[PDB]
Design an enzyme around this catalytic site. Structure first.
Site, PDB file in Angstrom:
ATOM      1  N   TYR A   1      26.949  49.013  35.962  1.00  0.00           N
ATOM      2  CA  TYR A   1      26.684  49.346  37.365  1.00  0.00           C
ATOM      3  C   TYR A   1      25.332  48.824  37.812  1.00  0.00           C
ATOM      4  CZ  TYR A   1      29.763  53.030  35.545  1.00  0.00           C
ATOM      5  OH  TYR A   1      30.729  53.743  34.888  1.00  0.00           O
ATOM      6  N   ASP A   2      24.436  48.600  36.862  1.00  0.00           N
ATOM      7  CA  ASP A   2      23.098  48.108  37.164  1.00  0.00           C
ATOM      8  C   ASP A   2      23.072  46.696  37.706  1.00  0.00           C
ATOM      9  OD1 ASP A   2      22.755  46.051  34.954  1.00  0.00           O
ATOM     10  OD2 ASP A   2      23.142  47.851  33.765  1.00  0.00           O
TER      11      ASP A   2
ATOM     12  N   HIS B   1      33.639  47.300  36.762  1.00  0.00           N
ATOM     13  CA  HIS B   1      33.592  48.740  36.930  1.00  0.00           C
ATOM     14  C   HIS B   1      32.726  49.090  38.118  1.00  0.00           C
ATOM     15  CE1 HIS B   1      34.914  49.438  32.514  1.00  0.00           C
ATOM     16  NE2 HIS B   1      35.945  49.352  33.333  1.00  0.00           N
TER      17      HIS B   1
END
Ligand SMILES: NC(=O)c1ccc[n+]([C@@H]2O[C@H](COP(=O)([O-])OP(=O)(O)OC[C@H]3O[C@@H](n4cnc5c(N)ncnc54)[C@H](O)[C@@H]3O)[C@@H](O)[C@H]2O)c1
Ligand SMILES: NC(=O)c1ccc[n+]([C@@H]2O[C@H](COP(=O)([O-])OP(=O)(O)OC[C@H]3O[C@@H](n4cnc5c(N)ncnc54)[C@H](O)[C@@H]3O)[C@@H](O)[C@H]2O)c1
Lengths: 662, 657
Positions: free
Chosen positions: B121-122, B158
């Site tokens: 997610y980063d 994701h």
């Protein structure tokens, strides 16, 4: 010819919708993101055995005689399986072989679909007709009939042959024809199924050859049903059935995710003129791609503005670059006059010059078009564009360069550097000035800062140029360090260390495995389309064609008999001098560091030396032919401030001595 | 130190490294980047949040290793009971933080990966990209796939919190994983199409990862050995056991345990990462020539495709080996920009010594024989320092060069047996006066070369047909406008229909893109032919001629007399090499005007130098017995060249001078 006008009549008739379909498709074609899902109909044109004719062979072999008719989707898939299950598998392959082993010809439509520069072509066909026309035209695609080939491909372009092919053998295992073939498709063709879908997601899809009741068209429609709304670009459909689509049908399928382009409605043809219907819907796109459909002054104004607006970010454009910008539609000469070149369509540039000449015609245009025309006029006046060569005359030519670096205003450049910047362009100019003064670590830091800021600022041009200039600065630093470590300590009488070890180590670490070749490719396709002219800035070497063109100055037969073939009544001397001036201005005004390299200096030296030698030879021949009083002390080469500074900057003592003694 | 690591690398390790590097030099490597990479940048590990939810939900930590189930359930229990707001609150708290691009990120982008799929997610991979200056279109949501603007992609499978630190933009809880393909159909497929068409190298995952294991269960279904086994860069402290290595290798992976590659303490992660990441894969980008047989294999691999052609220019060889060595016109070889093992020197040593040749294993003596024959025919003798008494010879076997028109007529009349004979017949027809027949034969060859081949004859036929069409157009232009006065009659060599047909057929043809459109394999194998599609074929030779003319004229003005080899021999050697290359390969470039001008200039300079060196035998030999004997004299080849490439004006000028 008459039909050409009728094609335009059809084009005129096109309702906005068909025009829009044609519009997006043609734009997509140019972008390099069009895909054609080509079905059976496009091959029934070549007479490839239609399927019902093979389902019929099986019905007749199996039961005894042809069916009533109207084989449904079920009978299309089950009669083949019944035979397969009851009469055999080796016979099934023999029936196929008899019909499908026949080599058929290639239709006109096959080259039109390929003429639109399709990125890929998906096809539910076993025939090798798309695959032969591809080869005839030269377009190399990677054919993917089997799963094994999905990974062993070579090109990113593909001829995805869903439903197999008989390249490996006419057996019904190398193809999808019967019910089970279609039932277990996903299990037996996992990678080909996926490749088709990802292509559908990304590229634009124009179906051609299918019905709206085809099995495959309606299968994709159910997949697209699942996809998120507006997560995909709606595909276009070319309905070439012999009648108008019932409006109800049009709507249902339109909402299911299609954008039909019925040919039956776009033209008029007999019930069995399938090819005509195809050509109609297909030609509108081909001609539209060529921009042949254009009549209004507003249209040419919009076209030229769309082509020219991205270049406003630059300060000067070479005349040769304008040729590539317009796609070889016109020749742009150093003289400033432009000429037609392989242009089959409206003379938009002729209209633009005619508008420029007359004020009333400009007043005819609208207000926004007036502002666009004003901007284009300003740009063309700045870059030096004149009317056509036919309307030319005693055109003058003067060289002027607006650059503090060229004039050696070191004090002014330092004063500008000391000031506070206000824009990223100011930062780029400051970095160029710092590099010009020898302060290279500061230039590298400023270029790094500009690179960091531009990507967030959406300034692709400055980003690209700063990356290139930083790479050139790094190369210059490396060669200077090598020279100083190799011989600098001796001639200077003491070892000099202009750069510290920490900075050298940091630059070596950061720029590791760097590659300037792939810099342009990684930029968005929009930038590559708008600013393709800058690609040459990333090459290892350039100015090779210019160097090769210098041969004309070495010609001897010209003195005995010269025709002035170069340009229009112009000698090679003027052409070469103007090319050199254009190159110098483009490089200096755009703050490019490539000026400081050996290749540019060598090219300048060669050009100047050959020009002066040709002038001397012409003077000598003129003296010889006529009396000595005729051109006895005439100077065939005239010098000015620009020539003086060029020679001073780009010549060595040995070169000057060689020129003087020659 | 890595030298020992390299030495230790088993065949397996180096094989993996080899393919990974090579895929990268082709542009087909993809890195699957997992969580670990971001923990190097101290980004909250997931279990940190699973445990935050496990504490705000229950009141304490799980005090145990989170299973694959609790990783996905604890987040969901919290969401279902404490809500979306808090779920997103903990998300914002832990993830709204900046962390540094760790070293491994840059190593990855230094492999210049084609794509980078990631389950993070980063935005750390994204930042390293911008900093490196490498662009990638980031797809982290369904809509992004349709609106992308580049071939390369940063597929965040994701999601990511770029649209906000909400849990609606990411896949962490259980329902998100269960309904993944339903919610992310486009990104699911995109990942799978890349996995299929690119070489995947996982990094940042453990063999027991949920994601790694799901991909492997899909590759099982591929079930057609249509997938390249994905490499898996293990980087856990302990060494991978064997029972697992076997099982997971059979399941589809190619593990590269960093623990085995380099020893390390329990928490030395960036160390294990770096070793396998760049100290091996990136450092092994070069060749591994260390045996007497690998030299022959490499040279054969680099030289075999050239067998399709008849002769190769010595200068062009500089590009075959990627500037590794300098090939001189006199047949000498010099080292230049080569830092690895010297394989051409080894080849020459083997050529000199028979015992070294005997040492070669079976199946490799024939390759050495073929290479020796090719080099002998091409004229490459040996390395510069061992130079002997170099000789110069001229031999052109092209029938058209000698002007044996009747023999070419007979050859055309006789039936052909191979496409090479058809190519020679087309060249003969072009040189005889049949543009239509030559064009038809070239088109026929283009059509019939569909069968498997090297793609060379097809490319040459296309170029020759384009040049023949250009010649036809120029001939028509000077016939309809000037042919009327030249002969007094409207000569119609070609009918209107044929001209219209040829104009229509190639109205879209563009010679600029001819090479680019060819298969990638052909581009990397026959790159030297690219220069045949522009004036770059005659750039270096022309500059060399200019420089030599300048030097010779300066020496002429000075009046010095050397007692060594002539300084204009290189001009003659280059001229004859270019003539042989252009005539033995049946190319129409011989008919170009620039080639004629270059030949004229070269021979004029040679004749002037010879005339000057004729008169020196009265000055240097008149004041002292010491003198020279070398000179230049007329011969059949020079006579033919002059008769073909000179005008009456040039000959008169040379006679006057
Ligand atoms: N199973 C059957 O329905 C059946 C049975 C016997 C004969 N036929 C004959 O087959 C013909 C076409 O039917 P179909 O089976 O292809 O399904 P179809 O008519 O649904 O074909 C769909 C697409 O194929 C194209 N197409 C059809 N016939 C073509 C032709 N002759 N030339 C070029 N393109 C063509 C059309 O443009 C259409 O968009 C009909 O005219 C019919 O007489 C069909
Ligand atoms: N099981 C848990 O959820 C849990 C709970 C509390 C603490 N921890 C601690 O966290 C560590 C890793 O947990 P995990 O379940 O993600 O392991 P994991 O094996 O699932 O990690 C996956 C991959 O990330 C790598 N990796 C792990 N820690 C790393 C680091 N600090 N830097 C770089 N790469 C790293 C591993 O080598 C592995 O290849 C363990 O050593 C453990 O002590 C784990």
């Amino acid at each position: 010819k008459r039909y050409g006008e009728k094609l335009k009549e059809v084009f005129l008739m096109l309702d906005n919708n068909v025009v829009e379909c044609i519009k997006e498709i043609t734009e997509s074609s140019r972008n390099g993101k069009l895909v054609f899902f080509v079905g059976a109909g496009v091959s029934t044109l070549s007479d490839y055995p239609q399927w019902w004719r093979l389902v019929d062979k099986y019905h007749e072999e199996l039961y005894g005689s042809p069916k009533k008719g109207n084989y449904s989707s079920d009978e299309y898939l089950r009669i083949p399986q019944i035979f397969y299950n009851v009469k055999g598998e080796m016979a099934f392959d023999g029936i196929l072989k008899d019909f499908f082993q026949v080599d058929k010809p290639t239709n006109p439509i096959h080259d039109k679909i390929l003429a639109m520069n399709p990125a890929h072509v998906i096809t539910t066909n076993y025939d090798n007709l798309i695959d032969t026309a591809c080869w005839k035209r030269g377009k190399y695609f990677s054919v993917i009939s089997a799963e094994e080939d999905v990974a062993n491909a070579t090109s990113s372009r593909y001829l995805l042959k869903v439903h197999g092919d008989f390249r490996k053998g006419f057996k019904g295992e190398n193809v999808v024809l019967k019910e089970d073939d279609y039932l277990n498709y996903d299990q037996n063709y996992p990678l080909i199924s996926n490749l088709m879908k990802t292509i559908i997601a990304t590229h634009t899809i124009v179906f051609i050859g299918y019905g709206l009741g085809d099995y495959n068209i309606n299968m994709l429609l159910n997949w697209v049903r699942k996809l998120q709304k507006d997560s995909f670009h709606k595909p276009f459909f070319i309905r070439t059935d012999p009648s108008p689509i019932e409006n109800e049908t049009l709507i249902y399928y339109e909402n299911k995710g299609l954008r039909i382009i019925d040919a039956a409605s776009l033209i008029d043809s007999n019930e069995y003129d399938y090819l005509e219907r195809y050509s109609a819907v297909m030609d509108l796109l081909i001609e539209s791609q060529e921009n042949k459909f254009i009549t209004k002054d507003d249209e040419v104004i919009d076209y030229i503005y769309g082509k020219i607006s991205p270049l406003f970010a630059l300060q000067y454009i070479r005349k040769i670059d304008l040729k590539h910008v317009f796609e070889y539609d016109y020749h742009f000469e150093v003289n400033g006059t432009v000429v037609r070149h392989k242009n089959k369509g409206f003379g938009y540039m002729e209209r633009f010059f005619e508008l420029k000449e007359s004020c009333d015609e400009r007043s005819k245009l609208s207000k926004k078009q007036y502002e666009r025309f004003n901007a284009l006029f300003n740009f063309f006046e700045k870059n030096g564009v004149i009317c056509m060569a036919k309307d030319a005359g005693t055109l003058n030519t003067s060289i002027e360069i607006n650059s503090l670096a060229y004039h050696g205003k070191y004090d002014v450049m330092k004063k500008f550097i000391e000031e506070q910047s206000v824009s990223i362009e100011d930062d780029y100019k400051k970095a160029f000035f710092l590099a010009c003064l020898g302060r290279w670590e500061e230039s590298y830091d400023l270029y790094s800062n500009i690179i960091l800021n531009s990507i967030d600022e959406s300034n692709g041009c400055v980003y690209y140029l700063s990356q290139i200039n930083r790479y050139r600065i790094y190369q210059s630093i490396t060669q200077a360090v090598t020279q100083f470590n190799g011989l600098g300590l001796l001639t200077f009488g003491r070892h000099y260390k202009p750069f510290t070890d920490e900075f050298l180590a940091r630059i070596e670490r950061e720029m590791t495995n760097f590659n300037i070749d792939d810099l342009f490719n990684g930029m968005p396709f929009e930038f590559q389309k708008k600013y393709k002219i800058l690609e040459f800035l990333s090459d290892n070497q350039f100015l090779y064609d210019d160097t090769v063109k210098l041969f004309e100055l070495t010609n001897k037969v010209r003195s005995e008999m010269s025709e002035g073939s170069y340009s229009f009544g112009m000698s090679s001397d003027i052409v070469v001098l103007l090319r050199l001036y254009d190159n110098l201005r483009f490089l200096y005004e755009n703050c490019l560091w490539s000026v400081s390299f050996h290749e540019f200096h060598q090219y300048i030296r060669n050009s100047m030396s050959l020009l002066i030698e040709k002038a001397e030879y012409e003077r000598t021949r003129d003296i010889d032919e006529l009396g000595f009083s005729f051109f006895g002390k005439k100077s065939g080469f005239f010098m000015e401030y620009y020539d003086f500074v060029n020679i001073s900057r780009h010549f060595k003592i040995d070169d000057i001595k060689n020129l003087e003694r020659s």
